[PDB]
Design an enzyme around this catalytic site. Structure first.
Site, mmCIF file in Angstrom:
data_model
loop_
_atom_site.group_PDB
_atom_site.id
_atom_site.type_symbol
_atom_site.label_atom_id
_atom_site.label_comp_id
_atom_site.label_asym_id
_atom_site.label_seq_id
_atom_site.Cartn_x
_atom_site.Cartn_y
_atom_site.Cartn_z
ATOM 1 N N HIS A 6 0.816 -1.240 0.000
ATOM 2 C CA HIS A 6 0.000 0.000 0.000
ATOM 3 C C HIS A 6 0.845 1.285 0.000
ATOM 4 O O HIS A 6 0.245 2.355 0.169
ATOM 5 C CB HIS A 6 -0.968 -0.022 1.185
ATOM 6 C CG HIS A 6 -1.905 -1.175 1.188
ATOM 7 N ND1 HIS A 6 -3.141 -1.110 0.606
ATOM 8 C CD2 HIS A 6 -1.799 -2.412 1.720
ATOM 9 C CE1 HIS A 6 -3.773 -2.242 0.803
ATOM 10 N NE2 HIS A 6 -2.961 -3.064 1.474
ATOM 11 N N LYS A 29 0.288 14.403 0.243
ATOM 12 C CA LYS A 29 -1.100 14.681 -0.219
ATOM 13 C C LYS A 29 -1.241 16.172 -0.584
ATOM 14 O O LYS A 29 -2.207 16.520 -1.284
ATOM 15 C CB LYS A 29 -2.104 14.218 0.842
ATOM 16 C CG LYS A 29 -2.263 12.703 0.934
ATOM 17 C CD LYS A 29 -3.008 12.226 2.176
ATOM 18 C CE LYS A 29 -3.050 10.717 2.357
ATOM 19 N NZ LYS A 29 -3.904 10.053 1.337
ATOM 20 N N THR A 79 -8.733 6.036 -2.609
ATOM 21 C CA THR A 79 -10.108 5.468 -2.707
ATOM 22 C C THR A 79 -11.133 6.578 -2.491
ATOM 23 O O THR A 79 -12.259 6.450 -3.031
ATOM 24 C CB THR A 79 -10.312 4.293 -1.740
ATOM 25 O OG1 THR A 79 -9.987 4.760 -0.434
ATOM 26 C CG2 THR A 79 -9.483 3.082 -2.102
ATOM 27 N N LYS A 129 -14.906 7.525 -4.427
ATOM 28 C CA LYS A 129 -16.135 7.901 -3.746
ATOM 29 C C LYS A 129 -16.713 9.184 -4.347
ATOM 30 O O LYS A 129 -17.929 9.279 -4.548
ATOM 31 C CB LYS A 129 -15.903 8.078 -2.238
ATOM 32 C CG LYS A 129 -15.319 6.874 -1.508
ATOM 33 C CD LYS A 129 -14.854 7.162 -0.081
ATOM 34 C CE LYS A 129 -13.983 6.059 0.472
ATOM 35 N NZ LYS A 129 -13.429 6.429 1.775
ATOM 36 N N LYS A 157 -8.998 13.678 3.675
ATOM 37 C CA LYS A 157 -8.014 12.574 3.701
ATOM 38 C C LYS A 157 -7.066 12.879 4.864
ATOM 39 O O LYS A 157 -7.053 14.026 5.345
ATOM 40 C CB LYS A 157 -7.256 12.466 2.373
ATOM 41 C CG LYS A 157 -6.595 13.760 1.909
ATOM 42 C CD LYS A 157 -6.049 13.736 0.489
ATOM 43 C CE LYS A 157 -7.121 13.597 -0.579
ATOM 44 N NZ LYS A 157 -7.008 12.316 -1.310
ATOM 45 N N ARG A 158 -6.284 11.900 5.297
ATOM 46 C CA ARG A 158 -5.294 12.137 6.377
ATOM 47 C C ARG A 158 -4.347 13.272 5.941
ATOM 48 O O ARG A 158 -4.071 13.423 4.729
ATOM 49 C CB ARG A 158 -4.577 10.823 6.709
ATOM 50 C CG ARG A 158 -5.459 9.798 7.414
ATOM 51 C CD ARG A 158 -5.851 10.194 8.829
ATOM 52 N NE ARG A 158 -4.680 10.260 9.707
ATOM 53 C CZ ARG A 158 -4.342 9.342 10.613
ATOM 54 N NH1 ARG A 158 -5.094 8.272 10.807
ATOM 55 N NH2 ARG A 158 -3.256 9.524 11.348
HETATM 56 C C1 LIG Z 1 1.203 1.866 12.045
HETATM 57 N N1 LIG Z 1 1.851 1.872 10.723
HETATM 58 C C2 LIG Z 1 3.311 2.008 10.608
HETATM 59 C C3 LIG Z 1 1.062 2.029 9.598
HETATM 60 C C4 LIG Z 1 1.621 2.168 8.310
HETATM 61 C C5 LIG Z 1 0.830 2.358 7.176
HETATM 62 C C6 LIG Z 1 -0.564 2.426 7.321
HETATM 63 C C7 LIG Z 1 -1.483 2.649 6.287
HETATM 64 C C8 LIG Z 1 -1.169 2.947 4.856
HETATM 65 C C9 LIG Z 1 0.076 2.760 4.251
HETATM 66 N N2 LIG Z 1 1.038 2.667 3.693
HETATM 67 C C10 LIG Z 1 -2.351 3.261 3.928
HETATM 68 O O1 LIG Z 1 -3.468 3.472 4.385
HETATM 69 N N3 LIG Z 1 -2.057 3.346 2.630
HETATM 70 C C11 LIG Z 1 -3.103 3.663 1.653
HETATM 71 O O2 LIG Z 1 -3.708 2.384 1.209
HETATM 72 C C12 LIG Z 1 -4.852 2.685 0.386
HETATM 73 C C13 LIG Z 1 -5.571 1.381 0.064
HETATM 74 O O3 LIG Z 1 -4.745 0.568 -0.772
HETATM 75 C C14 LIG Z 1 -4.404 3.425 -0.891
HETATM 76 O O4 LIG Z 1 -5.554 3.822 -1.644
HETATM 77 C C15 LIG Z 1 -3.595 4.672 -0.548
HETATM 78 O O5 LIG Z 1 -3.063 5.230 -1.742
HETATM 79 C C16 LIG Z 1 -2.468 4.334 0.449
HETATM 80 O O6 LIG Z 1 -1.817 5.526 0.897
HETATM 81 C C17 LIG Z 1 -1.125 2.275 8.583
HETATM 82 C C18 LIG Z 1 -0.335 2.078 9.716
#
Ligand SMILES: CN(C)c1ccc(/C=C(\C#N)C(=O)N[C@@H]2O[C@H](CO)[C@@H](O)[C@H](O)[C@H]2O)cc1
Ligand SMILES: CN(C)c1ccc(/C=C(\C#N)C(=O)N[C@@H]2O[C@H](CO)[C@@H](O)[C@H](O)[C@H]2O)cc1
Lengths: 808, 808
Positions: A349, A546, A648, A652, A540-541
């Site tokens: 991801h 971003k 995503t 939406k 978004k975050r």
């Molecule tokens: C605690 N820890 C170290 C973490 C590390 C990473 C993440 C989460 C992401 C990452 N990388 C994420 O959400 N990535 C998104 O995945 C979406 C679905 O595939 C894409 O649509 C989007 O483009 C990505 O940024 C969460 C916790």
């Protein structure tokens, strides 16, 4: 609204009866003492009763037919609210609306009482939730496995323009959807040491934590399929006065494993408690999988089991499966490895290197000493294969190693996942291509057959029928209801792009959504907006990649243009930005403060009037997405080319009748391809342009020197125009933009501002705006998570989807 | 069994239907997957449904009639199991037995699955539970208020003859009886500081813990009254990465307040967490009381409210009520004090000085600074009254002060309770007399009108109908069922003391109970006993004052007599001792080890055979009391005269057809008075004899020198006869008996052994044994907690009891 289902006489009668039964027997209230919260719970229990027969029958059906089972392992499930989703998928919405209306209650008021299940950070967590809905809708024997966090993603409060975090105590009032299964509790082992016997390795002297499962039903769309999401909760084993009391209080240390979701989706930290969470979900889940497999040798395991790893967070599944097969089942290494690789598949991801999990060896040595030995053995055998394929290529051996050398030796969990999986996928075509060309190039050269693409999608149940019933209805009027589980049927809407009735209806639905959202803002947040303005939305975050900052530069540009020529007409805009910052991410916290500081100036300038408003949307979460996305005119998808793996949120907005301003990044590329580039506001550097700029070196000063409008903004920031009391407040933001900007904000500024002028030009022509919107909605079909899951099913898991209904 | 109620066709049909409904919808099981535990829960939910209408109607009735409300404040509610008690009080037992039998289930097997609610240590906690049952049965508007401990009294395991403690995780599988009321959550304040304003004192800068109530129904006996027990649970208020995570984990510190019951019923320790528990229950309870009072000035408060303090543990009610009335409601001091005294009443449960709560001033100063100021003001005004009544008596002023001087200044909470209460009672006539003559003599001289007696009692629902249905039935055959809520009717049984049929029936019921208990021992604990032996039972907490050691000396005497004359006939005995030791109480732990060590020798001596068995009953608790007490022939109540305030175990044994061997201590005096001394095995020093021995000084050596049988036992203990591997194991016990015995074990040895010979003599004549048993059961009526509560109601609370039924 026909899409909301039938309100049968008998159905409405039985719902009213069961509602009154739950209020009396379940909640122990009468109508004299009952609060709205009691009424919400009575309704939730009434709807839950309709799931139970289908839930038991579905699991009985899987026991009898013994299909291949799909195990979706994720540390995050960003579920949001369940009541409306359940009513939609069981066709109960109109019946419950009628039943509650007849009891003197507003069902929409009761829906607002439910807490979000906020067990995720953003995209990765919400993808898992959309996937569970699609796997149920496609009749797959699928189980979501995760952690039941006591505290999900923090509630965001804005105090003096600054983010404050509050604990998300989402279980405060209880969760009617889950069923505790204390009888299926399993032990999980930590620490200890390995002794080598005649018979082989033994992991001894461990500390035990119990994993107690809670099951939540996942209903398919009107197919009577109800799958399970099983979330594990940590429990202490039952093993003078202060000493006895202290021993009971110390049970909290074991139970802390499932206490709280890590909110740092930006930056990997390497915390022991996070490693415990990762092993906890893996160890409990794999015992459950093996138990279910043995209840109707291991040669058949990959024919009966698929494990999908949602990023590297559950990567310990690979060495844990090897540990069970070799140490406990006494399979030889090579046979165990064959079974593991054929069972496991890995989804990546992100390409940002700071997000990649690289666990210090010393942490693994202390917590999971047997797992570290298995990882070393995997590494040695893997590097032996690399050496035989690329003889003499000693640098390739260093690059591909699961073990990273340095001050601190680390395990690269992405390398472990590729070695131990039959399939590796990215989440959009451009992302999957970047994986094969850059960060996993060496792995692609060794095993090209492993590398796949699975472009992301969103469920059209939650993200159209539930949040935008008005739009779902005017579509259903023309093409019927089949599109809700076959979204490609939206292509039929291209026949109506010149239909004056449909143009009027699409524009009316958007206007109604915008009035509804403008009202919500006044009621809940005492904020006034012009509902005839263009709703310009970036939710978004908060991450530098971003580029919320690029949006900020545009807002200040429009403000400065208005101040320079106050009596000139400009298209009125409401600019809305929302999202949470990770608690330790200082720059993300400064960006939120900048957005509120711009609002403080722009929103109180009498010369601007109602021509420009800047709103920070507090506490962005799944329930707020369901309100703001249907109200949006313009979707801001403005990541630096090559940084957003998919997105995503973009999908939406497309489905709900917003036009997109975006870079050629992630799924934006495929969305523009589907709709036509002429129906997208595409601007800025492509990936190739970013690479060329990196080769000669990014100099922000050059843009500052050549663009007077950009210089004016930087001077305003530096000089304290937006922070009169504290003039140096934004110096860190200015310093980053001028000297240390990894994401090249200035390089896309000119094209972005020009492209925003073209948006304003089209918005002045309502009929042509709406026709372009119809062309977007009509071509959004590819971005259904039903399409995504069908591709995982056929190309990775080796199972056929089905729209066939089970008997009710 | 007629006393178990009717099994109507319609009733059995509706129970089977609702059982199947709960198994499907509530537990989400079918009959293919269901375990016995699932069947228990389906039955519990089915029975709970029958409480709900009566529960709502009872509370509605109290709202309409607005009677004076009784608030019973206790840190302990030793409730045991709820399922059978609920069925008994609703007349559902036979109907549920039939319904479950028809579904192919054994209801007695399902009853054994329920966890005890072990929220107490022993007598004080079990008295609170008996009282709730009697207050519901007598139609009083009564509320029990306490703490919902996550962990109750520890589970006792015996390992190598030693007590081990295991956490009592009684909520592991859920509690079907309680209803969370998160909507009635109240704040409780700690720490902070007092500032004095123009308007008066303000308690500021406090830390907040939330008190969340859980309500449990308390059904009256067949009167459709269902009262409430409200237990408070502690919740944290919702107010970089490691920092955010650590702040969420630190919520555990607030929530630890309700985590665990203090098990030290022997010795006051002065722990901060115990003081937090005491204030927590008081502060939450008093806000609830005042809220209910204001919902239909404070002059009427004592007409509408009675607060009963179960010992000093909730004594902070007195200064908390003063704090609310003076600081928040702005009443003048003298008016607030009048209201407080007329509202509060205090029950004392011991004269042993080490059990009395004396809180260090420095702890109160830090935790509850405003309460300490109010206690000083109460003390000054109280000592002003003492000075005016006894001018020049400066030592009386020192003796009566709420503040104790010394190295560490302390608050005497018993002195606070007497000053702040209109009524002070002991729990048996001899105890109440000892309070007025010794420890509270000065207070009695100042305010004789305050001092009362309320002899303790036990509920005949739990302690006859529930645990001994066989005995309840043969009684009901002769005198009908009215005695179950009017126990004085047992006097009618004196008419049957010469009835050959009744003698046979009483003896048959005991024999059946003994066979049932002998079977339980083999099944659950692989222990074999002779069911024709005399069942000699001492069950109660392990305390030196209770003299389990005197019982041990008798057992060794019988063993030595058998070894000396193996071929002489002796009445076979099974000597059973059970009870928990407080975790820090070394001597109590050594006494358990001695009992198991005696068992190890006696039970494996081939010359003894089945003539003597010594069993330690592991994990004594309310559910085990319900099994062993109906099986007992001889009740051991052998505390040193003046040490056991009442006892209630004594009353349970009397009601269930055991004869008593006992000292003239606590309620034993009143039991012997009711039955006739000729029908009790009374031995040993009276209180007067103990006092005379203390005056000249207790010399244990004198008894050792003069009694050869006693010398032999001490030589056996010292020399390692009972610990061959570790010969000095019992040196601490020998040293205590010889040099430091506060409880004069040797002084009662000769009379005890002689009295035990008279027990053995009567047991050889079954007909005369049974006639004496009938004389005990027939005169047990006074020891109903219905009699006790009627006396509290008329003499302390100022309310009339009622056996009048509410409509169903
Ligand atoms: C605690 N820890 C170290 C973490 C590390 C990473 C993440 C989460 C992401 C990452 N990388 C994420 O959400 N990535 C998104 O995945 C979406 C679905 O595939 C894409 O649509 C989007 O483009 C990505 O940024 C969460 C916790
Ligand atoms: C934590 N802490 C310091 C504690 C202190 C004391 C206690 C409990 C007792 C005392 N004292 C108790 O149970 N006393 C019994 O009360 C029965 C009912 O009135 C009498 O029948 C019996 O005679 C008393 O010993 C519990 C905790």
């Amino acid at each position: 609204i026909s899409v909301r289902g039938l309100a049968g006489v008998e159905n409405v009668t039985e719902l009213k009866k069961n509602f009154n039964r739950h209020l009396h027997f379940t909640l122990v209230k009468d109508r004299n003492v009952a609060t709205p919260r009691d009424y919400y719970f009575a309704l939730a229990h009434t709807v839950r009763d309709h799931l139970v027969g289908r839930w038991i029958r579905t699991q009985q059906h899987y026991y009898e037919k013994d299909p291949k089972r799909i195990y979706y392992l994720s540390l995050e499930f960003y579920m949001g609210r369940t009541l409306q989703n359940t009513m939609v998928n069981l066709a109960l919405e109109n019946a419950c609306d009628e039943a509650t209306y007849q009891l003197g209650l507003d069902m929409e008021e009761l829906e607002e009482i439910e807490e979000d299940a906020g067990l995720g950070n953003g995209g990765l967590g919400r993808l898992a939730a959309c996937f569970l809905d699609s796997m149920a809708t496609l009749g797959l024997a699928a189980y979501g496995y995760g952690i039941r966090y006591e505290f999900g993603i923090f509630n965001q409060k804005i105090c003096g323009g600054w983010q404050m975090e509050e604990a998300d105590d989402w279980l405060r009032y209880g969760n009617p959807w889950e069923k505790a299964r204390p009888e299926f509790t399993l032990p999980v082992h930590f620490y200890g040491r390995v002794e080598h016997t005649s018979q082989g390795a033994k992991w001894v002297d461990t500390q035990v934590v119990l994993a107690m499962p809670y099951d939540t039903p996942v209903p398919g769309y009107r197919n009577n399929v109800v799958n399970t999401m099983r979330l594990w909760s940590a429990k202490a084993p039952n093993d003078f006065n202060v000493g006895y009391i202290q021993a009971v209080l110390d049970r909290n240390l074991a139970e802390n494993i499932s206490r709280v979701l890590y909110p740092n989706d930006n930056f990997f930290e390497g915390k022991e408690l996070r490693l415990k969470q990762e092993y906890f979900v893996v160890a409990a889940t794999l015992q459950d999988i093996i138990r279910r497999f043995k209840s109707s040798n291991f040669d058949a395991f990959p024919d009966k089991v698929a494990i999908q790893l949602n990023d590297t967070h559950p990567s310990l599944a690979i060495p844990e499966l090897m540990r069970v097969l070799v140490d406990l089942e006494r399979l030889d290494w090579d046979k165990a490895w064959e079974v593991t690789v054929k069972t496991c598949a890995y989804t990546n991801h992100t390409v940002l290197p700071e997000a990649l999990e690289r666990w210090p060896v010393h942490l693994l040595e202390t917590l999971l000493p047997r797992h570290l030995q298995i990882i070393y053995e995997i590494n040695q055998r893997f590097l032996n294969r690399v050496a035989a394929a690329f003889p003499g290529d000693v640098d390739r051996l260093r690059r591909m190693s699961l073990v990273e050398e340095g001050a601190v030796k680390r395990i690269n969990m992405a390398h472990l996942c590729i070695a131990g999986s039959h399939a590796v996928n990215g989440v959009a075509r451009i992302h999957s291509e970047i994986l094969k060309k850059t960060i996993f190039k060496d792995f692609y050269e060794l095993e090209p057959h492993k590398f796949q693409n699975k472009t992301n999608g969103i469920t059209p149940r939650r993200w159209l029928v539930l949040c935008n019933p008005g739009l779902a209805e005017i579509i259903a009027e023309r093409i019927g209801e089949e599109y809700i589980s076959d979204l490609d049927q939206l292509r039929k809407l291209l026949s109506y792009v010149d239909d004056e009735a449909f143009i009027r209806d699409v524009a009316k639905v958007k206007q109604e959504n915008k009035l509804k959202f403008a009202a919500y803002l006044e009621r809940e947040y005492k904020v006034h907006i012009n509902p005839n303005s263009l709703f310009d939305v970036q939710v978004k975050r908060i991450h530098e990649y971003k580029r919320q900052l690029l949006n900020c530069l545009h807002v200040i540009t429009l403000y400065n243009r208005i101040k320079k020529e106050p009596n000139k007409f400009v298209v009125p805009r409401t600019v809305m930005i929302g999202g949470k910052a990770a608690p330790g991410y200082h720059m993300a916290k400064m960006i939120i403060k900048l957005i509120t500081a711009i609002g403080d100036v722009v929103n109180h300038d009498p010369v601007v009037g109602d021509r420009l408003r800047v709103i920070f949307l507090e506490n962005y979460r799944v329930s707020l997405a369901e309100k703001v996305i249907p109200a949006a005119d313009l979707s801001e998808q403005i990541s630096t080319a090559g940084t957003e793996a998919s997105g995503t949120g973009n999908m939406k907005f497309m489905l709900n009748g917003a036009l997109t301003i975006g870079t050629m990044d992630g799924a934006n590329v495929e969305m523009a391809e589907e709709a036509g580039e002429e129906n997208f506001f595409i601007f800025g550097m492509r990936v190739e342009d970013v690479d060329r700029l990196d080769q000669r070196g990014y100099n922000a000063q050059e843009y500052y020197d050549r663009i007077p409008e950009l210089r004016q903004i930087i001077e305003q920031l530096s000089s304290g125009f937006f922070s009169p009391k504290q003039p140096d407040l934004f110096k860190d933001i200015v310093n980053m933009l001028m000297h240390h900007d990894r994401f090249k904000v200035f390089a896309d500024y000119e094209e972005y501002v020009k492209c925003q002028e073209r948006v304003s030009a089209l918005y002045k022509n309502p009929r042509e705006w709406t026709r372009m919107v119809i062309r977007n909605i009509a071509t959004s079909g590819k971005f259904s998570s039903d399409r995504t899951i069908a591709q995982y099913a056929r190309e990775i898991w080796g199972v056929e989807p089905s729209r066939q209904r089970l008997p009710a």
